[PDB]
Each structure stands twice: as C-alpha cells, then as structure tokens.
Amino acid sequence: MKAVIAKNEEQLKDAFYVREEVFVKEQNVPAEEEIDELENESEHIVVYDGEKPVGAGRWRMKDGYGKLERICVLKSHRSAGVGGIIMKALEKAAADGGASGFILNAQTQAVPFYKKHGYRVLSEKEFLDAGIPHLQMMKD
Secondary structure: OEEEEEOOHHHHHHHHHHHHHHHHHHOOOOOOOOOOOOHHHOEEEEEEEOOEEEEEEEEEEEOOEEEEEEEEOOHHHOOOOHHHHHHHHHHHHHHHOOOOOEEEEEEHHHHHHHHHOOOEEOOOOOEEOOOOEEEEEEEO
C-alpha cells in the first residue's frame, strides 16, 4: 500500500474511479452526482496496492481548518487497512498546507472508526454530502 497526492492525468483518473466505485456502483447515487464544483480547489490523495487504486479522499482549507471529505474505500478492501492510510495521508497533507485542526464529513456508518482515530461528533444533525448520509466530526 502506497499513498500519493494525485496531480497528473492517470492519478486523478484513478481517484475518481475509486470515488465512482463507492458512491455510484456500491450505493445508488446517480452517475456523476458524486462530483462537485470544489474538485479543482481541493487536493486529492490516492492509495495504491501495486498498480491498483484501492482508496481515495480530498481536503481543502476552510476557515483555518483542514476540511477532509469523500474518504472512499471500496468493499473489496475494507479489511485491508486502507482507511488509516488515507486519513493519515490527508492529515499530513493538510498540516503541511498550513491547516489548523481538522473537520471531517464522515459517512454515518463510519463514525465508530473515526472515533478510534481521535475524532468527535461535532453535531448530531445528519446531512447528505453526495446524496449520502454523513455526520460532521472534528479533531484538534
């Protein structure tokens, strides 16, 4: 497993292939409702196992905090430890970017995992991110 900041054509293509896998193929989100108007303002990370992309996520600076979003790990690799690798890579990149604290949009079912990594629920109100139920968490 190797995490990389996706900047070129093939790396970014792999990042969005992984996001399509989780939001569209696994969930039922319509074709491209998974992509928003903030992609060019965000930094993307992809995790590879050999040449196969097995994880992806993004972050951007927001009010001094590093905002982590759309952390995607397909079913086939849920017990492979890709989750901790993406999170750590994102936090690292955000920190280097001059971020102060982290705010995360987590899929409701993934909340337990994030608590294991120092995250606390910021609000009990659930919201749809890409048509999917999420909760917002924070880490100082």
